[PDB]
Amino acid sequence: DLPSLEAHVSVERQQIENRRDSDLEARAKKLENDLGELEAEGAKADVRRKVREGAEREMKQLRDRAQREIDRLDEVWSRFKNLKVQDLEGDELLYR
């Protein structure tokens, strides 16, 4: 049954990448809206750029979390691939 298994994991990865691109588009739109709202406000660079820095950090952590979750999905798939009897396995979360 392995064929269907890698088909399923590939489909999950494709959906994850689609969600990532949707997040990219949404954050780009939000940044554009924020820029437009404060486009006419003439103030210091940091005062107007603090919100932009926060949004960029939010996107950075979002992409880092996406990378981490895809990496753990790949790790779980690899672990199941080479699973045999008498294999000790801690990591309660991984077993669940």
The amino acid present at 57, given as its one-letter code, is: R
Which pair of structure tokens corresponds to residue 79?
A: 């672990």
Q: Do residues 38 and 6 lie in contact, with contact meaning Cβ atoms separated by under 8 Å? A: no
The residue to which tokens 């990448």 are assigned = 17
CB atoms under 10 Å from CB of 81, counted, come to 10
Q: Residue 68 to residues 2, 19, 25, 45, 79: CA-CA distances in angstroms?
A: 24, 14, 20, 33, 16
Which pair of structure tokens corresponds to residue 63?
A: 């992409």
Q: Do residues 76 and 45 lie in contact, with contact meaning Cβ atoms separated by under 8 Å? A: no
Q: Which residues contact 51 (CB under 8 A, 6 or more apart)?
A: 34, 38
